[PDB]
């Protein structure tokens, strides 16, 4: 059973910048015969099902950006990206078949870029969902650089920690950034009894947070 | 139009089993080897086995000989894994793939995934909130949002005007909490458009067969 090898596992570069990224194998992957290479090179973007790049070690496949070019024979293979685009961003996997077929472990593409402070934006819960008992406060903060970013709930001046659900997407395809969702869930009693509600963000690009609150009372 | 057709998300009790189909639209199906691949959530693939449908002669990953049962019908141009006595650890999407073997032996063609959950959780519907923007002075762009909540299990899908609104949406990877997933998406869009226009997100849940839309109104 051929082992195949990926390194570096992640790897985070700018747009209009080169990068390569290496698959070893641990025996040949060439056939004397046919004279070629039995080792693909795939590419599996967040959300959608793997894409073949290239074949024969250094064939592209059609659909495929001439920016991608793939190199080695025997048992040492290289993918370079000449120019990568915002799109590039992905995981590559690395793939024999000389014999059955082995995946590499993969090398996630991170694309870096300018710093985004974020688009915070707050929601109060839907007339809908207070009619069924319940109270769900969402932030969305969208659009930001880098991707550490904390998040802070306060009610009625003070921090809540209890019932907030967070959850982060992958870097976006287009403008490279980040998104973050995050929500407040409480009973419908428990939102009714306070007032004030506030969606705090600390991100890199300002000491001071980034603040977004709605008055319950109010339109 | 080399196409692979793969069902629908699958429930599963641990300990049964799931028969699962692929069909093969845009060439001569018994020209080209099936592959079948594995991808456990955030992480790399791996590759089931293969069948030549115009023998039924099949091959396979030893990690899944006995686990995994491999199948076709020549008629209906479909391909078919079984998977038996299953656990949590088979959870996961599953790919086929259209396999150019004596060529250029690489997975040219890979259906769209069919995810799997081994639980004996039951399938819950989502109930979808809309997310109406509050009192506040955040005003060319609108941001507006779906709280797709109390779920089970993955996945849903979300589109905004059922597909119309593609650019500005954020959908944001559910999160586990009880037995229950819970998923929030959001959408921008010019001040000019919203509430003078229709804003509508559309949740898919496969598993219970659900389909609601939700018409996001103002206050």
């Known amino acids: 059973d051929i082992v195949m090898s990926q390194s570096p596992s992640s790897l985070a570069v700018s747009a209009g910048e080169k990068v390569t990224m290496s698959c070893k194998s641990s025996?040949?992957?060439?056939?004397?015969?046919?004279?070629?290479?039995?080792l693909a090179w795939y590419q599996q973007k967040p959300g959608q099902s793997p894409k073949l790049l290239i074949y024969?070690?250094?064939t592209r496949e059609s659909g495929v950006p001439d920016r991608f070019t793939g190199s080695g024979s025997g048992t040492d293979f290289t993918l370079t990206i000449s120019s990568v685009q915002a799109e590039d961003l992905a995981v590559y996997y690395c793939?024999?078949?000389?014999?059955?077929?082995?995946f590499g472990g993969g090398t996630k593409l991170d694309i870096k870029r300018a710093d985004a402070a974020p688009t915070v934006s707050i929601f109060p819960p839907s007339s809908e969902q207070l009619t069924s008992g319940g109270a769900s406060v969402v932030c969305f903060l969208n659009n930001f650089y880098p991707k550490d970013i904390n998040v802070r709930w306060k009610i009625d001046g003070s921090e809540r920690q209890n019932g907030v659900l967070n959850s982060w997407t992958d870097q976006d395809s287009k403008d490279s950034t980040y998104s973050m969702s995050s929500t407040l869930t409480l009973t419908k009693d428990e939102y009714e009894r306070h007032n004030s509600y506030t969606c705090e963000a600390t991100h890199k690009t300002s000491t001071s947070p980034i603040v977004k609150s709605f008055n319950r009372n109010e339109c | 139009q080399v196409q692979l057709q793969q069902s629908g998300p699958e429930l599963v009790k641990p300990g049964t089993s799931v028969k699962m189909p692929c069909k093969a639209s845009?060439?001569?199906?018994?020209?080209?080897?099936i592959s079948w691949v594995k991808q456990r959530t955030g992480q790399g693939l791996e590759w089931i086995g293969e069948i030549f449908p115009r023998s039924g002669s099949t091959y396979y990953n030893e990690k899944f000989k006995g686990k995994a049962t491999l199948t076709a019908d020549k008629s209906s141009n479909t391909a078919y894994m079984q998977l038996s006595s299953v656990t949590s650890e088979d959870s996961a999407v599953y790919f086929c793939?259209?396999?150019?073997?004596?060529?250029?032996?690489?997975?040219?063609?890979w259906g769209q995934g069919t995810s799997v959950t081994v639980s004996s959780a039951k399938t819950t519907p989502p109930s979808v909130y809309p997310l109406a923007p509050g009192s506040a002075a955040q005003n060319s762009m609108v941001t507006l949002g779906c709280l797709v909540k109390g779920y089970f299990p993955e996945p849903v899908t979300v589109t905004w005007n059922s597909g119309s609104l593609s650019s500005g949406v954020h959908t944001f990877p559910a999160v586990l909490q009880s037995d229950l997933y819970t998923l929030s998406s959001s959408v921008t869009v010019p001040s000019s458009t919203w509430p003078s226009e229709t804003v509508t997100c559309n949740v898919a849940h496969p598993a219970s067969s659900t389909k609601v839309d939700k018409k996001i109104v103002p206050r």
């Open positions: 845009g060439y001569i199906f018994t020209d080209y080897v």
């Open positions: 793939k024999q078949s000389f014999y059955l077929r082995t």
């Open positions: 025996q040949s992957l060439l056939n004397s015969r046919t004279r070629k290479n039995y």
């Open positions: 793939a259209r396999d150019y073997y004596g060529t250029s032996f690489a997975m040219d063609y």
């Open positions: 024969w070690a250094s």
